[PDB]
Amino acid sequence: PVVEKIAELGKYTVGEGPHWDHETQTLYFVDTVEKTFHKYVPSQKKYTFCKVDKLVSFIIPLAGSPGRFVVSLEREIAILTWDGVSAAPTSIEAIVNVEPHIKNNRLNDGKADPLGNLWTGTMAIDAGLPIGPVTGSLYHLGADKKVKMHESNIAIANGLAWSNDLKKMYYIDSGKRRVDEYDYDASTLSISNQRPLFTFEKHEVPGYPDGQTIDEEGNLWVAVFQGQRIIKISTQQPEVLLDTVKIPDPQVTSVAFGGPNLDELYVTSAGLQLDDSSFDKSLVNGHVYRVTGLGVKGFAGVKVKL
């Protein structure tokens, strides 16, 4: 595989939430801590950003509605209307606050399932690794624009993916240092039968799982925060490590397939220095990377349907 640093993009405090819109060949992503959204159009070398005054953790185009995006603003799920280039949104319309009385929580990773439903989970704003408060839950946003809860006691609500046959959902609580698998019922949007798919400790994989995505062959690509890598793992059988790709930045946070043929992997990372880092500060930068030559394709990002 070839790993390239995307020079055009600079350094992010906590780059996260990459989303590839295939119809416009555009990558969107966030910096959680700096309260900014980012847009990159690789074919034209265009980069823009947009500032808000709440912590943000994902940005997904709204189905059927050009120029509108579903985003997180601390604990609110909101529709942002944005021209893709001005430094502030045109307007913000809140949809729902998922946890109105839990003042010290925030939303973290979120993604649409293959049907267009937004799934996303919460966590303490001061969550910590490897130990910290455990106050998060996992939700989806339903038809009556109210949330349904699917899991609780989550420390660090992170990456989501769904199997290509819509039978399984994969989920990461970074605090557990493992990837879980659930049976997923597409009819009722219910998950059940939680079991560990991949346990870091059994494979001497350092760091913590963070974001993840799935490829056309059904394998998972998982970002390893404080592991300086992405790993490829099987979904056909538990506890199988298929490949490792080293990424120069130690704090890799998430991954999305993109490019015209959906065979380039975009990788975000975090430059924020944490206490108890296993890496010296000079190494922790927060660049965005592109990985090519993996031999597989993924899928385009799914828009949220409301």
Q: What is the CA radius of gyration of the chain?
A: 18
Contact between 24 and 303 under an 8 Å Cβ cutoff? The reply is no
Residues 6+ apart with CB under 8 A from 47: 8, 9, 38, 39, 40, 41
Whether 210 sits among the annotated catalytic residues: the reply is yes
158 is in an annotated binding site: yes
Restricting to residues 35-94, name those near Mg ion by CB under 5 A: none
Does residue 122 belong to the site contacting Mg ion (CB under 5 A)? Answer: no
Residues 130, 184, 142, 210: what is their CA dihedral angle, to the nearest 10 degrees?
20
Residue 297 DSSP symbol: -
Contact between 38 and 46 under an 8 Å Cβ cutoff? The reply is no
From the list Mg ion, Hg ion, none, partner contacted by residue 89 (C-beta under 5 to 8 A by kind): Hg ion
Residues 6+ apart with CB under 8 A from 153: 134, 136
CB of 253 to Mg ion, least distance (A): 5
CA distance 25 to 111: 18
CB nearer to Mg ion: pick between 42 and 110: 110
What is the dihedral sign for C-alpha 105, 171, 301, 268? Answer: positive
Which residues make up the interface to Hg ion (CB under 5 A)?
Answer: 37, 50, 80, 82, 88-89
CB of 90 to Mg ion, least distance (A): 28
181 is in an annotated binding site: no
Closest alpha carbon to 14 in 69, 58, 48: 58
CA distance 226 to 241: 18
Q: Which of 99, 109, 181, 264 binds Mg ion (CB under 5 A)?
A: 109
CB nearer to Mg ion: pick between 211 and 259: 211
CB nearer to Hg ion: pick between 30 and 291: 30
CB nearer to Hg ion: pick between 29 and 200: 29
CB of 223 to Mg ion, least distance (A): 7
CB of 109 to Mg ion, least distance (A): 4
Site string for Mg ion, 133-172 (x = CB under 5 A): -------------------------x--------------
16 is in an annotated binding site: yes
Site string for Mg ion, 171-210 (x = CB under 5 A): ---------------------------------------x
215 is in an annotated binding site: no
The continuous run of DSSP H or E covering 181 comes out as strand 178-185
- Structure-block tokens of residue 114: 């293959």
From the list Mg ion, Hg ion, none, partner contacted by residue 9 (C-beta under 5 to 8 A by kind): none
Per the residue annotation, which of 31, 173, 180, 210 is the catalytic one?
210
From the list Mg ion, Hg ion, none, partner contacted by residue 37 (C-beta under 5 to 8 A by kind): Hg ion
Q: Rounded to a whole number, what is the largest CA-CA distance in the chain?
A: 49
From the list Mg ion, Hg ion, none, partner contacted by residue 109 (C-beta under 5 to 8 A by kind): Mg ion
CB nearer to Hg ion: pick between 88 and 115: 88
CA distance 277 to 207: 10
CB nearer to Hg ion: pick between 81 and 244: 81
Closest alpha carbon to 303 in 96, 32, 69: 69
Residue with tokens 């709440």: 54
Query: Looking at the annotation, which residues are catalytic?
Result: 210
Could you list the residues known to form a binding site, using ranges: 16, 106, 108, 126, 158, 210
Q: Which residues in this chain contact Mg ion in the complex, by CB under 5 A?
A: 109, 158, 210-211
